[model samples]
Target: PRKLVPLAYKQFSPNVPEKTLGASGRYEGKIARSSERFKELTPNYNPDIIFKDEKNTGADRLMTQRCKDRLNSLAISVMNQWPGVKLRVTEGWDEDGHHSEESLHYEGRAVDITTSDRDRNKYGLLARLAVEAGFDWVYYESKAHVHCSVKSEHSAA
Candidate 1:
Protein backbone atom coordinates (compact mmCIF):
# COMPACT_ATOMS: atom_id res chain seq x y z
CA PRO A 1 0.00 0.00 0.00
CA ARG A 2 1.22 3.53 -0.79
CA LYS A 3 0.94 5.39 2.49
CA LEU A 4 0.02 9.06 2.27
CA VAL A 5 0.11 10.94 5.58
CA PRO A 6 -1.84 14.03 4.51
CA LEU A 7 0.86 16.74 4.88
CA ALA A 8 3.12 14.28 6.71
CA TYR A 9 6.60 13.12 5.88
CA LYS A 10 6.56 9.65 4.31
CA GLN A 11 9.19 6.90 4.50
CA PHE A 12 10.90 5.08 1.66
CA SER A 13 12.06 1.47 1.83
CA PRO A 14 14.64 0.63 4.50
CA ASN A 15 17.65 1.54 2.42
CA VAL A 16 20.70 2.45 4.51
CA PRO A 17 21.49 6.17 4.09
CA GLU A 18 24.35 6.51 1.66
CA LYS A 19 27.63 7.68 3.16
CA THR A 20 27.69 10.40 0.50
CA LEU A 21 24.62 12.14 1.93
CA GLY A 22 22.61 11.78 -1.26
CA ALA A 23 23.85 14.73 -3.45
CA SER A 24 25.10 17.26 -0.89
CA GLY A 25 28.87 17.78 -0.73
CA ARG A 26 31.35 19.98 1.17
CA TYR A 27 33.27 21.53 -1.69
CA GLU A 28 31.42 24.44 -3.27
CA GLY A 29 31.54 22.67 -6.63
CA LYS A 30 30.62 19.38 -5.07
CA ILE A 31 27.54 20.80 -3.36
CA ALA A 32 24.35 19.35 -4.79
CA ARG A 33 22.97 22.67 -6.03
CA SER A 34 26.22 23.95 -7.51
CA SER A 35 27.75 21.05 -9.30
CA GLU A 36 27.06 20.05 -12.88
CA ARG A 37 28.48 16.73 -11.82
CA PHE A 38 25.90 16.68 -9.06
CA LYS A 39 23.07 17.26 -11.55
CA GLU A 40 24.39 14.46 -13.67
CA LEU A 41 24.00 12.06 -10.79
CA THR A 42 20.35 12.92 -10.10
CA PRO A 43 18.55 14.38 -13.08
CA ASN A 44 15.05 14.32 -11.72
CA TYR A 45 13.71 16.77 -9.10
CA ASN A 46 10.14 15.79 -8.28
CA PRO A 47 8.90 18.34 -5.76
CA ASP A 48 5.32 18.20 -4.48
CA ILE A 49 5.33 21.85 -3.36
CA ILE A 50 7.55 24.59 -1.99
CA PHE A 51 6.65 26.40 1.28
CA LYS A 52 7.95 29.02 3.71
CA ASP A 53 6.66 30.40 7.00
CA GLU A 54 4.45 33.33 6.14
CA LYS A 55 5.41 34.90 9.49
CA ASN A 56 9.08 34.95 8.63
CA THR A 57 10.97 35.95 5.48
CA GLY A 58 7.99 35.28 3.27
CA ALA A 59 8.58 33.69 -0.12
CA ASP A 60 12.09 35.04 -0.71
CA ARG A 61 13.59 31.74 0.35
CA LEU A 62 11.20 29.63 -1.64
CA MET A 63 12.88 27.82 -4.53
CA THR A 64 9.96 25.93 -5.96
CA GLN A 65 6.32 25.28 -5.12
CA ARG A 66 6.94 21.58 -4.79
CA CYS A 67 9.72 22.14 -2.21
CA LYS A 68 7.54 24.38 -0.07
CA ASP A 69 4.89 21.74 0.64
CA ARG A 70 7.46 19.15 1.65
CA LEU A 71 9.12 21.66 3.97
CA ASN A 72 5.85 22.64 5.63
CA SER A 73 5.02 19.00 6.25
CA LEU A 74 8.43 18.46 7.81
CA ALA A 75 8.18 21.50 10.07
CA ILE A 76 4.75 20.52 11.31
CA SER A 77 5.83 16.93 11.94
CA VAL A 78 8.96 17.98 13.82
CA MET A 79 7.02 20.26 16.11
CA ASN A 80 4.44 17.56 16.76
CA GLN A 81 7.19 15.15 17.81
CA TRP A 82 9.06 17.70 19.94
CA PRO A 83 6.60 20.29 21.04
CA GLY A 84 8.98 21.99 23.45
CA VAL A 85 11.95 22.20 21.14
CA LYS A 86 12.06 25.74 19.74
CA LEU A 87 13.37 25.80 16.20
CA ARG A 88 13.25 28.09 13.18
CA VAL A 89 13.85 27.33 9.54
CA THR A 90 16.92 29.36 8.55
CA GLU A 91 16.87 28.68 4.77
CA GLY A 92 14.77 26.99 2.09
CA TRP A 93 14.48 26.72 -1.72
CA ASP A 94 17.54 28.48 -2.98
CA GLU A 95 16.63 29.90 -6.43
CA ASP A 96 20.19 30.97 -7.07
CA GLY A 97 20.35 27.50 -8.57
CA HIS A 98 24.12 27.73 -8.76
CA HIS A 99 25.11 25.56 -5.83
CA SER A 100 23.91 22.17 -4.55
CA GLU A 101 22.59 20.28 -7.55
CA GLU A 102 21.53 17.04 -5.90
CA SER A 103 19.94 18.77 -2.93
CA LEU A 104 16.23 18.05 -2.60
CA HIS A 105 15.83 21.69 -1.67
CA TYR A 106 17.11 22.67 -5.09
CA GLU A 107 14.81 20.08 -6.55
CA GLY A 108 12.24 20.76 -3.81
CA ARG A 109 12.80 17.37 -2.22
CA ALA A 110 14.66 18.47 0.96
CA VAL A 111 14.86 21.00 3.76
CA ASP A 112 17.81 22.34 5.75
CA ILE A 113 17.08 22.61 9.46
CA THR A 114 18.27 24.58 12.51
CA THR A 115 17.41 24.31 16.19
CA SER A 116 18.34 25.57 19.68
CA ASP A 117 20.32 22.52 20.78
CA ARG A 118 23.94 22.77 19.69
CA ASP A 119 25.26 19.74 21.52
CA ARG A 120 26.26 16.90 19.22
CA ASN A 121 24.33 14.29 21.18
CA LYS A 122 21.21 16.42 21.29
CA TYR A 123 21.35 17.11 17.58
CA GLY A 124 21.74 13.45 16.89
CA LEU A 125 18.67 12.82 19.00
CA LEU A 126 16.71 15.40 17.02
CA ALA A 127 17.63 13.75 13.75
CA ARG A 128 16.82 10.34 15.18
CA LEU A 129 13.46 11.66 16.24
CA ALA A 130 12.72 12.77 12.69
CA VAL A 131 13.94 9.44 11.37
CA GLU A 132 11.85 7.53 13.85
CA ALA A 133 8.86 9.62 12.87
CA GLY A 134 9.31 8.35 9.29
CA PHE A 135 12.01 10.55 7.67
CA ASP A 136 14.78 8.10 6.87
CA TRP A 137 17.18 10.10 4.72
CA VAL A 138 18.98 12.56 6.99
CA TYR A 139 22.21 14.55 6.60
CA TYR A 140 24.30 16.82 8.80
CA GLU A 141 26.10 20.00 7.83
CA SER A 142 27.35 22.60 10.35
CA LYS A 143 26.74 21.62 13.95
CA ALA A 144 23.62 23.77 14.00
CA HIS A 145 21.99 22.49 10.82
CA VAL A 146 20.63 19.21 9.47
CA HIS A 147 19.22 18.23 6.09
CA CYS A 148 16.29 15.88 5.46
CA SER A 149 14.41 14.59 2.44
CA VAL A 150 11.54 12.37 1.39
CA LYS A 151 12.16 9.55 -1.01
CA SER A 152 12.11 10.63 -4.69
CA GLU A 153 11.10 7.75 -6.93
CA HIS A 154 10.04 7.26 -10.54
CA SER A 155 6.41 6.81 -9.68
CA ALA A 156 6.40 9.84 -7.38
CA ALA A 157 9.44 11.84 -8.50
Candidate 2:
Protein backbone atom coordinates (compact mmCIF):
# COMPACT_ATOMS: atom_id res chain seq x y z
CA PRO A 1 0.00 0.00 0.00
CA ARG A 2 3.00 2.30 -0.42
CA LYS A 3 4.64 3.72 -3.48
CA LEU A 4 8.29 2.91 -3.97
CA VAL A 5 10.34 6.08 -4.18
CA PRO A 6 14.05 6.64 -4.39
CA LEU A 7 14.10 9.86 -2.38
CA ALA A 8 12.03 11.24 0.45
CA TYR A 9 11.11 14.35 -1.52
CA LYS A 10 9.68 12.19 -4.28
CA GLN A 11 7.05 10.59 -2.11
CA PHE A 12 3.58 12.15 -2.24
CA SER A 13 0.41 11.86 -0.24
CA PRO A 14 -2.96 13.64 -0.01
CA ASN A 15 -2.53 14.69 3.58
CA VAL A 16 0.71 16.80 3.79
CA PRO A 17 4.41 17.28 2.63
CA GLU A 18 8.16 17.87 3.33
CA LYS A 19 11.16 20.27 3.05
CA THR A 20 13.55 17.66 4.28
CA LEU A 21 13.16 15.81 1.05
CA GLY A 22 11.40 18.45 -0.37
CA ALA A 23 -0.16 26.48 5.03
CA SER A 24 -2.01 29.22 5.96
CA GLY A 25 -4.04 31.76 7.07
CA ARG A 26 -5.51 28.63 5.56
CA TYR A 27 -2.78 28.72 2.83
CA GLU A 28 -3.85 30.47 -0.35
CA GLY A 29 -2.41 30.22 -3.89
CA LYS A 30 0.97 31.87 -3.53
CA ILE A 31 2.97 33.85 -1.02
CA ALA A 32 6.39 35.42 -1.25
CA ARG A 33 9.25 33.21 -0.05
CA SER A 34 10.65 36.14 1.90
CA SER A 35 7.48 36.44 3.91
CA GLU A 36 7.45 34.85 7.32
CA ARG A 37 3.96 33.36 6.91
CA PHE A 38 4.61 31.33 3.78
CA LYS A 39 3.72 27.79 2.77
CA GLU A 40 6.07 25.55 0.84
CA LEU A 41 5.42 21.89 1.41
CA THR A 42 6.99 18.84 -0.20
CA PRO A 43 5.80 15.35 -1.07
CA ASN A 44 7.94 13.61 1.52
CA TYR A 45 5.75 14.83 4.39
CA ASN A 46 2.49 13.82 2.90
CA PRO A 47 -0.43 11.45 3.66
CA ASP A 48 0.58 10.85 7.21
CA ILE A 49 0.87 14.45 8.35
CA ILE A 50 -1.70 17.24 8.38
CA PHE A 51 -1.07 20.93 9.12
CA LYS A 52 -3.92 22.71 10.86
CA ASP A 53 -4.63 25.60 13.22
CA GLU A 54 -5.61 25.43 16.85
CA LYS A 55 -4.63 27.29 19.99
CA ASN A 56 -4.65 30.65 18.18
CA THR A 57 -2.02 29.36 15.77
CA GLY A 58 -1.37 29.69 12.07
CA ALA A 59 -0.72 26.75 9.75
CA ASP A 60 2.14 28.42 7.88
CA ARG A 61 4.60 25.74 6.85
CA LEU A 62 7.92 27.37 7.39
CA MET A 63 10.97 26.25 9.33
CA THR A 64 14.74 26.14 9.33
CA GLN A 65 16.14 23.58 6.86
CA ARG A 66 17.33 20.97 9.34
CA CYS A 67 14.19 21.35 11.39
CA LYS A 68 12.15 20.43 8.37
CA ASP A 69 14.27 17.33 7.98
CA ARG A 70 13.59 16.48 11.60
CA LEU A 71 9.84 16.83 11.02
CA ASN A 72 9.92 14.58 7.99
CA SER A 73 11.84 12.05 10.00
CA LEU A 74 9.24 12.29 12.74
CA ALA A 75 6.36 11.89 10.29
CA ILE A 76 7.92 8.74 8.83
CA SER A 77 8.59 7.23 12.21
CA VAL A 78 5.04 8.01 13.32
CA MET A 79 3.52 6.45 10.20
CA ASN A 80 5.58 3.30 10.58
CA GLN A 81 4.42 2.97 14.16
CA TRP A 82 0.76 4.02 13.94
CA PRO A 83 -0.02 3.30 10.29
CA GLY A 84 -3.21 5.39 10.38
CA VAL A 85 -1.80 8.32 12.24
CA LYS A 86 -2.31 11.81 10.85
CA LEU A 87 0.35 13.88 12.51
CA ARG A 88 -0.89 17.44 12.58
CA VAL A 89 1.28 20.52 13.01
CA THR A 90 -0.53 23.18 15.00
CA GLU A 91 2.01 25.97 14.81
CA GLY A 92 5.43 26.73 13.38
CA TRP A 93 6.93 30.22 13.15
CA ASP A 94 5.55 33.29 14.94
CA GLU A 95 7.89 36.21 14.95
CA ASP A 96 7.59 38.38 18.08
CA GLY A 97 4.50 36.51 19.13
CA HIS A 98 3.25 34.68 22.21
CA HIS A 99 6.08 32.65 23.71
CA SER A 100 9.03 33.05 26.07
CA GLU A 101 10.26 36.03 23.99
CA GLU A 102 13.26 34.12 22.54
CA SER A 103 11.48 30.90 21.58
CA LEU A 104 12.71 28.65 18.80
CA HIS A 105 9.36 29.11 17.02
CA TYR A 106 10.65 32.52 16.11
CA GLU A 107 13.80 30.89 14.76
CA GLY A 108 11.71 28.40 12.76
CA ARG A 109 13.11 25.42 14.61
CA ALA A 110 10.06 24.47 16.59
CA VAL A 111 6.48 23.18 16.21
CA ASP A 112 3.45 22.32 18.28
CA ILE A 113 1.74 19.17 17.08
CA THR A 114 -1.56 17.98 18.44
CA THR A 115 -1.27 14.74 20.38
CA SER A 116 -4.99 13.94 20.39
CA ASP A 117 -6.20 14.15 16.80
CA ARG A 118 -5.19 11.51 14.26
CA ASP A 119 -2.32 10.72 16.58
CA ARG A 120 -4.68 8.26 18.32
CA ASN A 121 -4.41 9.84 21.77
CA LYS A 122 -0.86 8.68 22.20
CA TYR A 123 0.53 11.80 23.82
CA GLY A 124 3.34 10.07 25.65
CA LEU A 125 4.41 8.05 22.65
CA LEU A 126 4.30 11.18 20.48
CA ALA A 127 6.68 13.03 22.75
CA ARG A 128 8.94 10.01 22.86
CA LEU A 129 9.03 9.87 19.09
CA ALA A 130 9.90 13.56 19.01
CA VAL A 131 12.98 12.66 21.04
CA GLU A 132 13.72 9.84 18.61
CA ALA A 133 13.21 12.20 15.70
CA GLY A 134 16.12 14.26 17.02
CA PHE A 135 14.28 17.25 18.41
CA ASP A 136 16.65 18.88 20.89
CA TRP A 137 13.77 19.55 23.28
CA VAL A 138 10.55 17.57 23.51
CA TYR A 139 7.66 18.27 25.85
CA TYR A 140 4.21 16.84 26.16
CA GLU A 141 1.89 19.70 27.10
CA SER A 142 -0.51 17.59 29.10
CA LYS A 143 -3.41 16.50 26.84
CA ALA A 144 -3.00 19.14 24.21
CA HIS A 145 0.08 18.89 21.98
CA VAL A 146 3.70 17.91 21.82
CA HIS A 147 6.01 20.88 21.61
CA CYS A 148 9.30 19.94 19.97
CA SER A 149 12.41 21.96 19.34
CA VAL A 150 15.42 21.27 17.14
CA LYS A 151 18.79 22.68 18.06
CA SER A 152 20.34 25.54 16.15
CA GLU A 153 23.87 25.11 14.87
CA HIS A 154 26.12 26.62 17.50
CA SER A 155 27.24 30.16 16.81
CA ALA A 156 30.68 31.28 17.94
CA ALA A 157 30.98 33.80 20.73
Candidate 3:
Protein backbone atom coordinates (compact mmCIF):
# COMPACT_ATOMS: atom_id res chain seq x y z
CA PRO A 1 0.00 0.00 0.00
CA ARG A 2 1.18 3.52 -0.74
CA LYS A 3 2.15 5.38 2.40
CA LEU A 4 0.13 8.34 3.63
CA VAL A 5 3.25 10.51 3.68
CA PRO A 6 4.45 11.99 0.43
CA LEU A 7 7.72 10.48 -0.82
CA ALA A 8 9.41 13.85 -1.14
CA TYR A 9 9.05 14.45 2.58
CA LYS A 10 10.38 11.01 3.41
CA GLN A 11 13.23 10.57 0.95
CA PHE A 12 14.45 13.79 -0.57
CA SER A 13 14.71 17.33 0.81
CA PRO A 14 13.00 18.05 4.08
CA ASN A 15 12.00 21.40 2.65
CA VAL A 16 9.41 19.50 0.64
CA PRO A 17 6.01 20.30 2.04
CA GLU A 18 4.09 17.64 3.87
CA LYS A 19 0.78 16.24 2.70
CA THR A 20 -2.09 18.07 4.33
CA LEU A 21 -5.80 17.62 4.66
CA GLY A 22 -7.44 19.97 2.21
CA ALA A 23 -10.76 21.72 2.59
CA SER A 24 -12.26 18.96 0.50
CA GLY A 25 -11.01 16.46 3.11
CA ARG A 26 -8.64 15.00 0.60
CA TYR A 27 -4.92 14.68 1.15
CA GLU A 28 -2.99 17.15 -0.96
CA GLY A 29 0.61 18.08 -1.51
CA LYS A 30 2.77 19.94 -3.95
CA ILE A 31 2.99 18.11 -7.27
CA ALA A 32 6.30 17.41 -8.93
CA ARG A 33 6.80 19.73 -11.84
CA SER A 34 9.04 19.40 -14.87
CA SER A 35 11.93 21.76 -15.38
CA GLU A 36 14.57 22.47 -17.98
CA ARG A 37 16.71 19.94 -16.18
CA PHE A 38 13.99 17.35 -16.66
CA LYS A 39 13.83 18.13 -20.34
CA GLU A 40 17.49 17.18 -20.60
CA LEU A 41 16.63 13.69 -19.44
CA THR A 42 15.38 12.73 -22.87
CA PRO A 43 17.43 12.26 -26.06
CA ASN A 44 20.42 12.29 -23.69
CA TYR A 45 19.43 10.00 -20.82
CA ASN A 46 16.43 8.14 -22.07
CA PRO A 47 14.85 5.63 -19.68
CA ASP A 48 12.58 4.08 -22.23
CA ILE A 49 14.20 0.69 -22.23
CA ILE A 50 11.51 -0.95 -20.18
CA PHE A 51 8.28 -1.55 -21.97
CA LYS A 52 5.10 -0.53 -20.26
CA ASP A 53 3.28 -3.22 -18.37
CA GLU A 54 0.46 -3.53 -15.92
CA LYS A 55 2.85 -2.95 -13.07
CA ASN A 56 5.29 -0.72 -14.89
CA THR A 57 3.42 2.09 -16.52
CA GLY A 58 5.36 5.02 -17.94
CA ALA A 59 3.76 7.62 -15.67
CA ASP A 60 6.31 8.29 -12.95
CA ARG A 61 8.85 10.11 -15.07
CA LEU A 62 9.31 13.39 -13.24
CA MET A 63 12.42 13.51 -11.08
CA THR A 64 13.50 15.63 -8.13
CA GLN A 65 15.84 18.58 -8.42
CA ARG A 66 18.73 16.70 -6.89
CA CYS A 67 17.98 13.66 -8.99
CA LYS A 68 17.92 15.59 -12.23
CA ASP A 69 21.24 17.21 -11.43
CA ARG A 70 22.91 13.97 -10.49
CA LEU A 71 21.50 12.11 -13.47
CA ASN A 72 22.92 14.70 -15.84
CA SER A 73 26.28 14.32 -14.17
CA LEU A 74 26.07 10.58 -14.38
CA ALA A 75 25.18 10.74 -18.05
CA ILE A 76 28.17 12.95 -18.71
CA SER A 77 30.46 10.58 -16.85
CA VAL A 78 29.20 7.61 -18.81
CA MET A 79 29.61 9.43 -22.07
CA ASN A 80 33.15 10.30 -21.07
CA GLN A 81 34.01 6.65 -20.63
CA TRP A 82 32.18 5.56 -23.76
CA PRO A 83 31.75 8.55 -25.95
CA GLY A 84 28.20 8.97 -27.25
CA VAL A 85 27.03 6.41 -24.77
CA LYS A 86 23.35 6.52 -23.92
CA LEU A 87 22.50 4.67 -20.76
CA ARG A 88 19.00 3.36 -21.02
CA VAL A 89 16.93 4.15 -17.98
CA THR A 90 15.24 0.94 -16.95
CA GLU A 91 13.48 2.51 -14.02
CA GLY A 92 12.95 6.03 -12.75
CA TRP A 93 10.08 7.02 -10.52
CA ASP A 94 8.36 3.67 -10.01
CA GLU A 95 4.80 4.37 -8.96
CA ASP A 96 3.56 1.25 -10.75
CA GLY A 97 3.84 -1.14 -7.81
CA HIS A 98 7.14 -2.63 -8.91
CA HIS A 99 9.28 -1.35 -6.05
CA SER A 100 9.42 -1.56 -2.29
CA GLU A 101 7.34 0.56 0.02
CA GLU A 102 10.36 2.69 0.90
CA SER A 103 11.76 2.96 -2.59
CA LEU A 104 13.34 6.32 -3.34
CA HIS A 105 12.01 5.95 -6.89
CA TYR A 106 8.69 7.01 -5.48
CA GLU A 107 10.30 10.34 -4.70
CA GLY A 108 12.20 10.50 -8.00
CA ARG A 109 15.47 10.18 -6.14
CA ALA A 110 16.56 6.90 -7.70
CA VAL A 111 17.06 5.26 -11.10
CA ASP A 112 18.08 1.99 -12.72
CA ILE A 113 20.20 1.75 -15.83
CA THR A 114 19.77 -1.07 -18.26
CA THR A 115 22.76 -3.38 -18.75
CA SER A 116 23.83 -6.01 -21.21
CA ASP A 117 26.79 -8.26 -22.01
CA ARG A 118 28.36 -5.48 -24.01
CA ASP A 119 28.19 -3.17 -21.04
CA ARG A 120 28.63 -5.70 -18.29
CA ASN A 121 32.30 -4.93 -17.82
CA LYS A 122 31.41 -1.29 -17.48
CA TYR A 123 29.42 -1.94 -14.31
CA GLY A 124 32.31 -0.85 -12.14
CA LEU A 125 32.71 2.28 -14.18
CA LEU A 126 29.01 2.95 -13.96
CA ALA A 127 28.95 2.48 -10.22
CA ARG A 128 31.91 4.79 -9.81
CA LEU A 129 30.32 7.33 -12.08
CA ALA A 130 27.11 7.19 -10.08
CA VAL A 131 29.03 7.90 -6.89
CA GLU A 132 31.00 10.67 -8.50
CA ALA A 133 27.69 11.98 -9.74
CA GLY A 134 26.64 12.42 -6.08
CA PHE A 135 24.67 9.24 -5.71
CA ASP A 136 24.90 7.81 -2.20
CA TRP A 137 23.76 4.33 -3.13
CA VAL A 138 25.12 2.51 -6.17
CA TYR A 139 24.69 -1.18 -6.70
CA TYR A 140 25.09 -3.42 -9.72
CA GLU A 141 22.82 -6.42 -9.98
CA SER A 142 24.47 -9.09 -12.07
CA LYS A 143 22.57 -9.95 -15.24
CA ALA A 144 20.28 -7.07 -14.41
CA HIS A 145 21.15 -3.39 -14.16
CA VAL A 146 22.82 -0.69 -12.10
CA HIS A 147 20.73 0.94 -9.41
CA CYS A 148 21.64 4.40 -8.15
CA SER A 149 19.96 6.45 -5.48
CA VAL A 150 20.57 9.65 -3.53
CA LYS A 151 18.40 8.73 -0.59
CA SER A 152 20.90 6.70 1.41
CA GLU A 153 23.73 7.86 3.66
CA HIS A 154 26.16 5.10 2.71
CA SER A 155 27.75 3.90 -0.50
CA ALA A 156 27.42 0.47 -2.04
CA ALA A 157 30.37 -1.84 -2.27
Against the true structure, whose lDDT is highest?
2
How many pairs of residues in model 2 come into backbone collision? 4
Candidates' TM-scores? 0.48, 0.62, 0.56
Off by over 4 Å in 2: 1-47, 53-59, 115-120, 154-157
lDDT of model 1 at position 115: 50
lDDT of each: 0.44, 0.56, 0.49
Off by over 4 Å in 3: 1-57, 115-118, 152-157
lDDT of 3 at 67: 61
Where is the poorest 10-residue window by lDDT in model 3? 20-29
Clashing pairs in 2: 16-46, 17-45, 18-42, 24-27
Q: Judging by TM-score against the true structure, name the best candidate.
A: 2
Clashing pairs in 3: none
Q: List the candidates ranked by lDDT, beginning with the highest.
A: 2, 3, 1
lDDT of 1: 0.44
Q: What would you estimate as the lDDT of candidate 3?
A: 0.49
- Report the lDDT tens digits of candidate 1 across residue range 1-157: 4443212232222345422334222222222345453332322122322233533534224333333444545556556645654434545544456344444555445555655443344454455544554543665554665666554333223
| Model 2 residue 116 distance off true place after TM-score fit, in angstroms | 7.3
lDDT of 2 by residue, 42-145 (tens): 22345556777444434336675667788888888777767766567877765446766455665566788753254435766777776677765666654666
* Of 1 and 3, the candidate ranking higher by lDDT: 3
